[PDB]
Amino acid sequence: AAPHHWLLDKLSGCYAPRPSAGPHKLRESLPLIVFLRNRLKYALNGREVKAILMQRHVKVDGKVRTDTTYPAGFMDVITLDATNENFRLVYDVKGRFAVHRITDEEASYKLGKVKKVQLGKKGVPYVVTHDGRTIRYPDPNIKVNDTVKIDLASGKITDFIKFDAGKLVYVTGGRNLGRIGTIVHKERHDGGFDLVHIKDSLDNTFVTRLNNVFVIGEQGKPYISLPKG
Amino acid sequence: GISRDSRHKRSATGAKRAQFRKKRKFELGRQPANTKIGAKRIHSVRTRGGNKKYRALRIETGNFSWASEGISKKTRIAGVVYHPSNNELVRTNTLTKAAIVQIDATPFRQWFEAHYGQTLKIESSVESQFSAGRLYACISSRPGQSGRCDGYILEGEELAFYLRRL
């Protein structure tokens, strides 16, 4: 009854935890019970993960948010107070949620793909992201599928990454879900299979969608740290 | 009303053997409230949470708009002479959207004499109604959904556009 992304062992139970509503969707997130209890194993059961949630160790996106099924989606920096645990969780190359450990100056921010820019009411420019941070007043040159950098103390955009040909992009969606390498090709079609294409070890080619891909930095310099093997 | 579904009827291919289903809640066709003239009574019906809908049946105080200056002012209703979305609708003298209804234009006289001084540049076949009192004006607002009677006056081109018709 589980998805593939959670890295959930089959010998666990019968009812799978539906995440509650929140920032991200159901299909692109993992809740805190499947995060803490059975992935990096700070708990043994739902009772004691509710106990540490009542103790309020979790500090995801700089706020506490004491809830069992809180849908932590892409790169919400899970922060735990004891042993200064800073966790940025991204996608691995085979579809799961690889939770990388980072440090404090990297967990002081996150980034987010812009979805739409609106002239909503009363002359106010407007920007949303995958956690829905409706932050005030970016520059006019925010296209769709660019990348804002959230402040995580206040909410303001601090840095901006422009989407164009020659940018380091992350793909979350479809049969390319979780690949990095961002350059063999660029092809913007007019309604589907439109993208920037991603290399491999032998620099192979790949096809995805615009909304299923979003930028993380430059060719060699992302200010996100990434795990390795 | 009854329905909103393609299941009771045929598509662009000509199919049969329908016998489909007990009709759901979200195929809700309410009764056609033919709004008339009377004393102002609006039924406050519910839908989709607290989505109150104003179903007007006997509305009078039409806010009709002077066109060339855009002056939406308050007046009464007389009757619709031509509306061939149903040619019996004008026989029964109801009041729906996009109907051409007659208005005693006395507050428009008051506004003209108030912001121009003299009484009577404006077209002659509406100057005749400036003199007489009853001018033609077409309803914009939806009394069956928003419960209101707003409209726009007939001024020249749109006037002859309807007068050549009927």
Binding site: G191 | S11, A12, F161, R165
Partner: protein
């Protein structure tokens, strides 16, 4: 160009642009045609996907019946049986489409029972 009642007019001569690589002809920007559901001035907005094919019949007005044959890699009897599709489409003030006439259409806002596509191109 007025054969029906009830103030045949644009609904706020009027002119807009859907963008996205589809031209608006100059009579459809400034001309006497009303463009009620032709998407260049229109009331509809564009979205979705864009399909291309030749026609079969343009008998009634505001009905463009496209044909659409396409390749599909059949593995069953290992030969390609040829595709055919149909879609009705509203008019545009740019081309009286006759038989032949490969044209393309964009998805928007169901107009009749079966039309979501309106002509944006002729070539």
């Amino acid at each position: 160009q007025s054969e029906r009642a009830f103030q045949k007019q644009p609904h706020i001569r009027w002119y807009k642009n859907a963008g996205l690589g589809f031209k608006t002809p100059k009579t459809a920007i400034e001309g006497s045609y009303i463009d009620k559901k032709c998407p260049f001035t229109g009331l509809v907005s564009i979205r979705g996907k864009i399909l291309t094919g030749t026609v079969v019949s343009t008998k009634m007005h505001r009905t463009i019946v496209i044909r659409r044959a396409y390749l599909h890699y059949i593995p069953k009897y290992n030969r390609y049986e040829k595709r055919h599709k149909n879609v009705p489409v509203h008019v545009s003030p740019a081309f009286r489409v006759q038989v032949g006439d490969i044209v393309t259409v964009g998805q928007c806002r169901p107009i009749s029972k079966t039309v979501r596509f309106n002509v944006v191109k002729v070539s």
